[PDB]
């Protein structure tokens, strides 16, 4: 019965036969502790070639945000002002889906792309409390502070297991430091498209810019990192006066 559940859960990723081949793994996966003791790791399934392996208000509570300041993550929707195509062409993809969000059927996220300061992350931290009216283990992260300590080493076998297939991922900022990121997030964004999952984005630049800036050499490994980030959704503008 567990196999049935898992099969259909990841049937977008698994090749029926792959499931039966990695049966031992998936069965050992469910049989062991699905939790940890730091709350130090938890088991998650990953597809490696042809085999599946196992790698390790009263609304903001059981959440587990990574590498972020403690109390900045409190934002609502009445308080969020409604302005330009920064906020009048977005509440058309946000509200069509509210109390209607499935797993076993991919959903539409968003990619907030634009300037340096206006309002990158106020439409990924506000909705993280719509993902707090129902309460998901919604992740909120600084990717400027993510390609540094995970280059380090000690512990490194499994460091991004909460940055893959969590019910929600409100990715914020990537503006610091053929890249050290093609067997990393480029295969992280692979499990966000075959185990039935959507993700959330916001950063400093834009789709056109980021493709022209990633991975350089003397190789289209710079123009494959970013359609792993232009698939589940269509990016829309952010415009308005400065906020500093």
């Amino acid at each position: 019965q567990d196999v049935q559940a898992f099969l259909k859960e990841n049937e977008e990723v698994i090749d029926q036969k792959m499931i039966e081949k990695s049966l031992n793994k998936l069965y050992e996966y469910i049989e062991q502790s699905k939790n940890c003791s730091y709350c130090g790791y938890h088991p998650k399934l990953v597809v490696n070639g042809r085999s599946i392996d196992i790698e390790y208000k009263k609304q903001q509570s059981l959440m587990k945000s990574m590498y972020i300041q403690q109390d900045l993550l409190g934002a609502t929707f009445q308080q969020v002002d409604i302005s330009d195509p920064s906020r009048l062409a977005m509440f058309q993809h946000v509200t069509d889906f509210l109390k209607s969000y499935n797993e076993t059927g991919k959903g539409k996220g968003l990619y907030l792309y634009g300037k340096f300061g206006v309002g990158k992350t106020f439409m990924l931290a506000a909705i993280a409390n719509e993902l707090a009216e129902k309460e998901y283990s919604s992740m909120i992260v600084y990717v400027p502070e993510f390609v540094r300590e995970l280059k380090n080493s000690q512990t490194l076998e499994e460091k991004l297991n909460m940055v893959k297939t969590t019910p929600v991922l409100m990715l914020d900022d990537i503006g610091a430091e053929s890249w050290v990121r093609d067997e990393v997030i480029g295969t992280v964004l692979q499990h966000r498209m075959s185990q039935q999952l959507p993700t959330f984005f916001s950063s400093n630049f834009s789709p056109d810019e980021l493709k022209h800036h990633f991975t350089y050499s003397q190789e289209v490994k710079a123009a494959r990192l970013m359609e792993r980030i232009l698939y589940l959704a269509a990016p829309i503008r952010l415009d308005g006066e400065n906020r500093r």
Binding site: N35, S37, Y38, C39
Partner: protein, 358 residues
Amino acid sequence: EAEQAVLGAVFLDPAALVPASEILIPEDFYRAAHQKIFHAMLRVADRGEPVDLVTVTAELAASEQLEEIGGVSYLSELADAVPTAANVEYYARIVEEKSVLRRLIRTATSIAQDGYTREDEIDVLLDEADRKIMEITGIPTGFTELDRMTSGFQRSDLIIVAARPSVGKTAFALNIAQNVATKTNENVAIFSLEMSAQQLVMRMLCAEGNINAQNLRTGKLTPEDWGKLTMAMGSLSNAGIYIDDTPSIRVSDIRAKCRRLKQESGLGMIVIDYLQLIQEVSEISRSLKALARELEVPVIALSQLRPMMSDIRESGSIEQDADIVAFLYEIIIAKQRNGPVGTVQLAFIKEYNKFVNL
């Protein structure tokens, strides 16, 4: 001197034959006056039919047997002894320990002669001559969950836990006995022999206060665990759990030490150090099963091991008089002298020493 006494108790029950029909048969008679008496007893309770003193005495007057025993004078003195009651079985075993012998001993007399009489045979003189020889109710375990299958830990049992070497059972045998002294009332005796009195104090606070991701050994924690602590030791006084380690006190001594408290508090639980460090086990461990029955205390007289049953039932008892026996790896109570023998879904954080359910 069993036979002089044994019948006395059997009399006034009317059910001192339930284990006694199991123990003694019409062969179990060293004596001569006694053998037909019991057959006049056994003929009765087969309807049955009813059971009392006399239903046998006028039965004996009938089918050829009354002076055979010297009148009713000794038929009276079958009764006149048993200066006791709290034994239980017990007792008829004395007669069975006058019995078992000769079913394994009277069967070796012919042979002692089957060499100068049966001269004359040899091999078949073995095939047969060796054959004969043989012949919440119900106090919870702390949980609000383990409260509806069996319930208790009621009022009297023997419990012996065996999981992988020194794990969370080490915690659990005692994490059975937590929500009883502080969070309700009943003072529970948790004595020790391995983990001393100066070894079971800092880690109950690890188990209580939202304080353990630190840890607590350094003296001073972080600016939060002192704002959130008054849970761990504040009500410890008005509770009722205290710790001892009289090196390794024997099976009679603690058995005789749980008499200070049985008068004082009533004695609620006895969480003992593994009955294996206490001083081949179907013998030594049979002095804490019955202490539960008279002292009226749940007695956690334990073990130190995978888990499997006739595997701790290996060199000793365990699958016998011993009551409920669970199996930690999820609590696999694949044995519980309790009724609903079953597994309860659980887990563990290991972060703040607090265990989980589902």
